[PDB]
Amino acid sequence: QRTPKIQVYSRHPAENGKSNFLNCYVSGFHPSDIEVDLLKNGERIEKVEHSDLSFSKDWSFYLLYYTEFTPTEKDEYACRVNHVTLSQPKIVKWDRDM
Amino acid sequence: GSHSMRYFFTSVSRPGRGEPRFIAVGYVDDTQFVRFDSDAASQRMEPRAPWIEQEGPEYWDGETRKVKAHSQTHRVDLGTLRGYYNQSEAGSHTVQRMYGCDVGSDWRFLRGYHQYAYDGKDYIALKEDLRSWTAADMAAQTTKHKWEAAHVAEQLRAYLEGTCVEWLRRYLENGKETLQRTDAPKTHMTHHAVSDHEATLRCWALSFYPAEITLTWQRDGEDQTQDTELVETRPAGDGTFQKWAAVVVPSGQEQRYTCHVQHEGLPKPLTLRW
Amino acid sequence: AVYDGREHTV
């Protein structure tokens, strides 16, 4: 069993009040069953899409989860992941400089 | 430059009820162009790039028939492999298959590959010459003897050295506007003060295609890896890619450090400096 | 286009 790697990031450099896309990239996991949610101030975002399942040279899986969003000064964004390897969901906060 | 066509197939058994979950994707280089998903209502191979949409009804009928046949091969294999490994009927298990062809800059055959895994570990694969097999354990060795008697390597080689290359060349021509375009990285540097005495420099590469890139830090013209961090290459979501590399430096000494960017879309490598 | 030959099980 391999635990997911997680990156949370915007498509375009973040500027407060300007329309954008929020990404959660999960990779390096096995088996393929996984739960991924995008959060705004701790609440699940409803209109989230994902890529078609594929895998890397080492047979580990990867997926991109994504939604339209408008960042602000005060609003907090995060990605929440559950997998058979995790005893509870893992929450990674969006850092606009990473 | 060189080009590839690659297909990826995943099946996951559902022991409580019904047939395995089956997902197929096809790529030219770093561009996805088709999918099949057993859970979707269409039960068709579907387009995922604009340049494949011009293929006529005979294309979509044939690809749908063949991808369904691949899913039935996986279903039988999941039952066989449970037996070879003496496993119970209670657990979910996985098979993964990848195959395809590379061409050189001349668009002529360079190499082919065909690889299979059970529960995320190597099972059986063609060797580089496409004329013999690598079997990881004694279950896969019984499969190797069966496929030697049935001349399976010769049947796969005919596709990988022939048909596979003909289709890749058709797609490269039809999709020229994007598949033959290189998008060089859009680069910049940011600065973040940790304390009054140490700072982080972050070298960004954005909106590039293809995904292959190298970012390197130098101090006074010598490679530095200590006090550095580099994230894995990640998708932007619009078909392009992103990466960054960072170094921690004494505040006031930023000018000693250079970030070096190598990519297919750059005639010469780029050097950035704060 | 996908493999266009005869398929074989393990």
CB contact under 8 A, A31 and B120: yes
Residues B129 and B186 occupy one common structural domain:
no
CA distance B7 to chain A (A): 10
Q: What is the separation, in whole angstroms, between the first and last Cα of chain A?
A: 28
- Cβ of B25 under 8 Å from any chain A Cβ? yes
Query: Which domains occur in chain A, in start order?
Result: 1-98 (2.60.40.10)
Q: Is A21 on the interface with B (CB under 8 A)?
A: yes
Query: Do B230 and B128 share a structural domain?
Result: no
Instruction: DSSP for C1-10, please give it.
Output: ----S-----
| B236 CA: distance to closest CA in chain A (Å) | 5
- Locate tokens 């250079």: which residue? B258
Cβ-defined contact of C10 to B123 (cutoff 8 Å): yes
Q: Which of B120, B154, B181 is the last residue of a domain?
A: B181
Q: Whose CA is closest to A11, among A68, A54, A81?
A: A68
Distance in angstroms (rounded) separating the CA atoms of residues A3 and A30: 7
Work out whether the CA dihedral B168, B171, B177, B183 comes out positive or negative.
negative
- Please check whether residue B5 is in contact with residue B100, taking contact to mean a CB–CB distance below 8 angstroms: yes
- Final residue in a domain of this structure, among B155, B181, B207: B181
CATH number, position B266: 2.60.40.10
| Torsion, CA A80, CA A31, CA A59, CA B96, rounded to 10 | -130
Closest in B8, B117, B120 to A54, CB measured: B8
Q: Are B155 and C5 in contact (CB under 8 A)?
A: yes
Q: Does any CB of chain B come closer than 8 Å to the CB of residue A31?
A: yes
SS3 B41: coil
**Residue B5: strand pairing partners:** B28, B101
Question: Which residue range forms the structural domain that includes residue B11?
Answer: 1-181
H-only helix segments in B33-175: 57-84, 138-149, 152-158, 164-174
Q: In Å, how far are A70, A76, B44, B189, B236 from A20, measured between CA atoms?
A: 6, 15, 32, 21, 11
SS3 B157: helix
Q: How many domains does chain B divide into? A: 2
- Angle between the B57-84 and B138-149 helix axes, to the nearest 10 degrees? 130
Contacts of A52 in chain B (CB under 8 A): 23, 25, 32, 35, 37, 48
> What residues of chain B lie within 8 A of the CB of A7, using their CB?
231-232, 234
Compute the distance between CA of residue B268 and CA of residue B140 in angstroms, rounded to an integer. 47
Q: With 0-12 CB in 10 A as exposed, 13-18 as middle and 19+ as buried, what is B35?
A: buried
B175 with B202, same domain: the answer is no
A7 touches chain B (CB under 8 A): yes
C3 and B66 within 8 Å at the Cβ level: the answer is: yes
- Resolution for the entry shown, Å: 1.4
Q: Write b or e for each residue in A41-77: b if 16 or more Cβ atoms lie within 10 A of its Cβ, otherwise e.
A: eeeeeeeeeebbbbbeeebbbbbbbbbebebeeeeeb
* Closest Cα in chain C, distance from residue B220 (Å): 51
Determine phi and psi for B169, rounding to 5 degrees: -65, -40
Q: Do residues B62 and B33 share a domain?
A: yes
Tell me the CATH number at B7.
Answer: 3.30.500.10
Shortest CB distance from B159 goes to which of C4, C8, C9? C4
Residue B190 buriedness (CB in 10 A; 0-12 / 13-18 / 19+): middle
Give the residue carrying structure tokens 């070298």.
B203
Of chain C, the end-to-end C-alpha distance in Å amounts to 23
Chain C positions in Cβ-Cβ contact with residue B167 (cut-off 8 Å): 1
